[PDB]
User: Fold this.
Amino acid sequence: YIVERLCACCYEQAWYAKLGGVVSIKFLMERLPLTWVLQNQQTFLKALLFVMMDLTGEVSNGAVAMAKTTLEQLLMRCATPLKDEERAEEIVAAQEKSFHHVTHDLVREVTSPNSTVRKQAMHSLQVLAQVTGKSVTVIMEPHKEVLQDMVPPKKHLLRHQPANAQIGLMEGNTFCTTLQPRLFTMDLNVVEHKVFYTELLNLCEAEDSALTKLPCYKSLPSLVPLRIAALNALAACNYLPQSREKIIAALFKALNSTNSELQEAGEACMRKFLEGATIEVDQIHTHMRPLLMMLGDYRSLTLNVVNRLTSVTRLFPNSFNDKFCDQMMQHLRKWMEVVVITHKGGQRSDGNEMKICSAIINLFHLIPAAPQTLVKPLLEVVMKTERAMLIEAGSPFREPLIKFLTRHPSQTVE
Assistant:
């Protein structure tokens, strides 16, 4: 009755009721013995995860972090292997049964449409596989019966599912297909996987003007998380030779865009994609061609294009050459002259004041093709700008310049 009434507080509406319920659960699992907390771990987990499922979308006072910490403690407690001095026929059986049930419910809630509970379940599975000294797959291999119809959409026309459910399905597919050994192999041969891959490609490659026509996406405020999830799911399929060019094309299209958050998501997915696949300089040039071929005019530069340059350089150091370094130095000199002119004019702040020059300077320390000779012209232009603006302590060019100078200490100090 104690556990019933106390964990029942987790189902009340108010947030303080949930907080008291989780506090009582923590007290019960910390003070009382192991043999008893195991058989109640099912109800404890259910209640303390329903707390999260219900508190999403409303103000709360640290209840989410407290619930996450309590979940971590309960999982690392009940999952801890029993030492030989305490192993017995009843405690071992109770632990095994509680572990089975908890893992079953966790794999069930993994594909839930809520993001917070899904991330919490993923972290719990990871830490549980870490503690038990086993892989996540072998632990989920018996439990994948629940996800036989979840990871494969069964050609359910995901376009009919809501945006949050779609994002949840994408994240579940990413998690289940990115373990040490993959639980489900997206062979891209059955009609189900084929339809799923085609939907992923059309979602991550189409345009917003046509993508917003769907009713499921008509009410979305940003539509960026959907594209991010689509890119993440598409990168997890780096085991299909005959169907790899489209993945690279989509990842590069996402790596060259006029948005910052999506550019970062695309570069992250590419870095994750390169862990299993490889890309030769041929297709690198083929895909970055529209990114280049426009730098001829220094005015064409901007924060987005320099960020894309930085990303493609960080992902492929051997892609750029010394000629590109000289062109970048010329563009930097031009932009520094423009900045000096604008500062002498003293009209008003703009969006091309310092960030562009800082990014262009940072580009050098990431390109290994940058020669030692580039230190002197860069230092000269930096000194010219500093003494034209008379900004010494607040100069934002110090950090990237020092980052580059550290690459050639011999020439620098000399």
In short: Residues 10 and 373 are 66 Å apart (CA to CA). The chain is about 65% helix and 0% strand.
